[PDB]
Design an enzyme around this catalytic site. Sequence first.
Site, PDB file in Angstrom:
ATOM      1  N   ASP A 231       0.812  -1.223   0.000  1.00 58.73           N
ATOM      2  CA  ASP A 231       0.000   0.000   0.000  1.00 58.73           C
ATOM      3  C   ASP A 231       0.841   1.268   0.000  1.00 58.73           C
ATOM      4  O   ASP A 231       0.500   2.224   0.702  1.00 58.73           O
ATOM      5  CB  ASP A 231      -0.957   0.030   1.214  1.00 58.73           C
ATOM      6  CG  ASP A 231      -2.036  -1.056   1.156  1.00 58.73           C
ATOM      7  OD1 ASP A 231      -2.234  -1.681   0.067  1.00 58.73           O
ATOM      8  OD2 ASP A 231      -2.721  -1.251   2.199  1.00 58.73           O
ATOM      9  N   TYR A 270       1.031  -7.848  -3.808  1.00 59.33           N
ATOM     10  CA  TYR A 270       0.653  -8.864  -2.815  1.00 59.33           C
ATOM     11  C   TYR A 270      -0.610  -9.633  -3.190  1.00 59.33           C
ATOM     12  O   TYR A 270      -1.106 -10.405  -2.399  1.00 59.33           O
ATOM     13  CB  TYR A 270       0.497  -8.271  -1.396  1.00 59.33           C
ATOM     14  CG  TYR A 270      -0.572  -7.211  -1.281  1.00 59.33           C
ATOM     15  CD1 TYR A 270      -1.915  -7.537  -1.098  1.00 59.33           C
ATOM     16  CD2 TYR A 270      -0.228  -5.868  -1.352  1.00 59.33           C
ATOM     17  CE1 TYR A 270      -2.882  -6.554  -0.996  1.00 59.33           C
ATOM     18  CE2 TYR A 270      -1.171  -4.872  -1.262  1.00 59.33           C
ATOM     19  CZ  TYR A 270      -2.496  -5.209  -1.077  1.00 59.33           C
ATOM     20  OH  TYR A 270      -3.416  -4.166  -0.998  1.00 59.33           O
ATOM     21  N   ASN A 358      -6.537 -11.511   8.706  1.00 55.04           N
ATOM     22  CA  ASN A 358      -6.702 -10.103   9.036  1.00 55.04           C
ATOM     23  C   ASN A 358      -8.124  -9.891   9.528  1.00 55.04           C
ATOM     24  O   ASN A 358      -9.084 -10.105   8.786  1.00 55.04           O
ATOM     25  CB  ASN A 358      -6.424  -9.226   7.816  1.00 55.04           C
ATOM     26  CG  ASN A 358      -6.182  -7.775   8.184  1.00 55.04           C
ATOM     27  OD1 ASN A 358      -5.787  -7.465   9.308  1.00 55.04           O
ATOM     28  ND2 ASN A 358      -6.418  -6.876   7.236  1.00 55.04           N
TER      29      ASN A 358
HETATM   30  O1  LIG Z   1      -3.779  -6.772   2.872  1.00 52.95           O
HETATM   31  C1  LIG Z   1      -2.749  -6.133   2.938  1.00 52.95           C
HETATM   32  N1  LIG Z   1      -2.680  -4.798   3.112  1.00 52.95           N
HETATM   33  C2  LIG Z   1      -3.778  -3.850   3.257  1.00 52.95           C
HETATM   34  C3  LIG Z   1      -4.789  -3.678   2.053  1.00 52.95           C
HETATM   35  O2  LIG Z   1      -5.282  -2.326   1.939  1.00 52.95           O
HETATM   36  C4  LIG Z   1      -5.583  -1.604   0.796  1.00 52.95           C
HETATM   37  C5  LIG Z   1      -5.088  -0.303   0.759  1.00 52.95           C
HETATM   38  C6  LIG Z   1      -5.306   0.527  -0.338  1.00 52.95           C
HETATM   39  C7  LIG Z   1      -6.066   0.058  -1.411  1.00 52.95           C
HETATM   40  F1  LIG Z   1      -6.286   0.874  -2.464  1.00 52.95           F
HETATM   41  C8  LIG Z   1      -6.590  -1.237  -1.382  1.00 52.95           C
HETATM   42  F2  LIG Z   1      -7.323  -1.644  -2.447  1.00 52.95           F
HETATM   43  C9  LIG Z   1      -6.357  -2.080  -0.282  1.00 52.95           C
HETATM   44  O3  LIG Z   1      -6.024  -4.375   2.241  1.00 52.95           O
HETATM   45  C10 LIG Z   1      -6.546  -4.712   3.525  1.00 52.95           C
HETATM   46  C11 LIG Z   1      -8.064  -4.512   3.514  1.00 52.95           C
HETATM   47  O4  LIG Z   1      -8.369  -3.112   3.400  1.00 52.95           O
HETATM   48  C12 LIG Z   1      -5.896  -3.887   4.613  1.00 52.95           C
HETATM   49  O5  LIG Z   1      -6.532  -4.202   5.865  1.00 52.95           O
HETATM   50  C13 LIG Z   1      -4.397  -4.207   4.600  1.00 52.95           C
HETATM   51  O6  LIG Z   1      -3.662  -3.496   5.614  1.00 52.95           O
HETATM   52  C14 LIG Z   1      -1.429  -6.853   2.826  1.00 52.95           C
HETATM   53  F3  LIG Z   1      -1.567  -8.152   2.373  1.00 52.95           F
HETATM   54  F4  LIG Z   1      -0.708  -6.200   1.885  1.00 52.95           F
END
Ligand SMILES: O=C(N[C@H]1[C@H](Oc2ccc(F)c(F)c2)O[C@H](CO)[C@@H](O)[C@@H]1O)C(F)F
Length: 630
Positions: A231, A270, A358
């Site tokens: 992110d 990811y 998560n």
């Molecule tokens: O899942 C991950 N990271 C984030 C990632 O966050 C995002 C952040 C920005 C985005 F544009 C997006 F599409 C997803 O997705 C999850 C659900 O929102 C978050 O809780 C996580 O912290 C990890 F695997 F990289």
Amino acid sequence: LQPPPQQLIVQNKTIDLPAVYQLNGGEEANPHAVKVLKELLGMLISIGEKGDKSVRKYSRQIPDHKEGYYLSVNEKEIVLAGNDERGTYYALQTFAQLLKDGKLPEVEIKDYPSVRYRGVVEGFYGTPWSHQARLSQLKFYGKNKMNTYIYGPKDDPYHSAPNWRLPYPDKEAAQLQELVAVANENEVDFVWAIHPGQDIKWNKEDRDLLLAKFEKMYQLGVRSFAVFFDDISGEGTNPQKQAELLNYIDEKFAQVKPDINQLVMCPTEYNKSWSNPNYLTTLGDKLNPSIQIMWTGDRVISDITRDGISWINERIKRPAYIWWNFPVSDYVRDHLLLGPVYGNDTTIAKEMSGFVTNPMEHAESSKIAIYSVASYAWNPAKYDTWQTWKDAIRTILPSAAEELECFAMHNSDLGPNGHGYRREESMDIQPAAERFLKAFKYDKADFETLQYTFERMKESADILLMNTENKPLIVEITPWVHQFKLTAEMGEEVLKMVERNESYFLRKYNHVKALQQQMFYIDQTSNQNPYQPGVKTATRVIKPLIDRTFATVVKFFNQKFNAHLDATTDYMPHKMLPLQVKANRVLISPEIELDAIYPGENIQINFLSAGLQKAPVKFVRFQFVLTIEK
Ligand SMILES: O=C(N[C@H]1[C@H](Oc2ccc(F)c(F)c2)O[C@H](CO)[C@@H](O)[C@@H]1O)C(F)F
């Protein structure tokens, strides 16, 4: 038994927990397992790890797997034999679930996990878990044989931007130190993660500061570490530099300390959809092979499939360490996600190095998914979605299990969202629902079914609010429970409108509009976060049926009686595509008259903006959002 063991032979005979016993090996066995045993407590009881004097007699029975154990209960003697110390503790966790009414079944168990690392990453956006909730989490992990807790809350300023370079202040550091001690007591690896990427420089100064921070964490007791690069934009997304940094941590720190366990990284790419068609093969080839690489699947929110996991594994050259984005709700903050865990392939254990979940910012509420993930990751081959959900709920709230099931069954869908990710909800009544409307736009049984459901919802709401067995859980869900009760009341009143006389219909009608306004006020005063404020519940099936039935029976009343009753289903004090009210924004769902005069702030438009400078405003004439002072 949760998780269900790999192998189990039950005899159909019972044994009193021995009033008189001879403990063999308690001074040499895993002290954490011995402590559990002595609390649960002549007949021989043997506890120990393979190689210990106490259990040498059973060495051939002990599964040759990390975290494995042999458990035996017969008239003659009890055996609790780990393949290693964690295994012994896991034998104890199983043992405690056999013990019922002072009695034990005659059983032989051979057990071990199919997935090596199993647990939770606290890695969501939003209010991080309280200290108390984390403590309670760690005990629950141990009971359920989860051995991994990855600390990484996105909004902890010492985990991520901009203060990842600073040691935690004294108070927070004393708290983490306690978390680490408690984790250890429950056989959980505390993995402290860092999220430096948005502003890391690829230089010595930032490399050293990152190592200095890990050393501080190490002094607090931390023995597993992660670096997240998800992110983020800019230079921090460069794969070669990521691998180089991780290999440097590995070689100067993880392999130099005597006792470091997991070293984990979260890639920038990811999930499959976010992956350009060579970031991932660069990581696979350059990153030291003992280093774990995380993956959320085909999309940011997805369930893991055989094809999807094979796609990742080939690029990264190791088995993916799964970060499963459920029940995280930080993109649908107005919903609770209390349904069952399903959708993940149950035959791909060998293809994964780990599986973590998560969860929601609501720690206790997350125990439903968490307990289910624990069961899945330990024994995916026997994973039973529905039974495990029921067992989770009954472990979490034995005093009101049925009421929690009722609430949870109608609080499982996310509603529409940018990720397109949905869950089933209210499936049992959906047939009676969909047939009742069709006919309306009906069978007596469908009517009584809906009626039964509303009745039950109210019973569940009122018993849940007053439950004292798990107060922190009840505090988390309370706003949704109020909203849930209101929904069921509106449902009962709407059904009464479907059934006698003009006067009685108007009483029910008026009582419905009042219930709509109550729900609105709960939606405007509870859970007022910046992103998805408010409180939605029973959104997939129940609310839509009630609203539509209401629109319909009103339409028919206006036709029959030549009346002009308003058929709107959600209360909205302002007038104008429904208007929405989100905090101090009044917006047109992608001339407006407000219910009173307010100081104006700004008007934002997208097909742009104007400042209003606190000018009084009631009418706006021309996203399309008015922000007022409120
Ligand atoms: O899942 C991950 N990271 C984030 C990632 O966050 C995002 C952040 C920005 C985005 F544009 C997006 F599409 C997803 O997705 C999850 C659900 O929102 C978050 O809780 C996580 O912290 C990890 F695997 F990289």
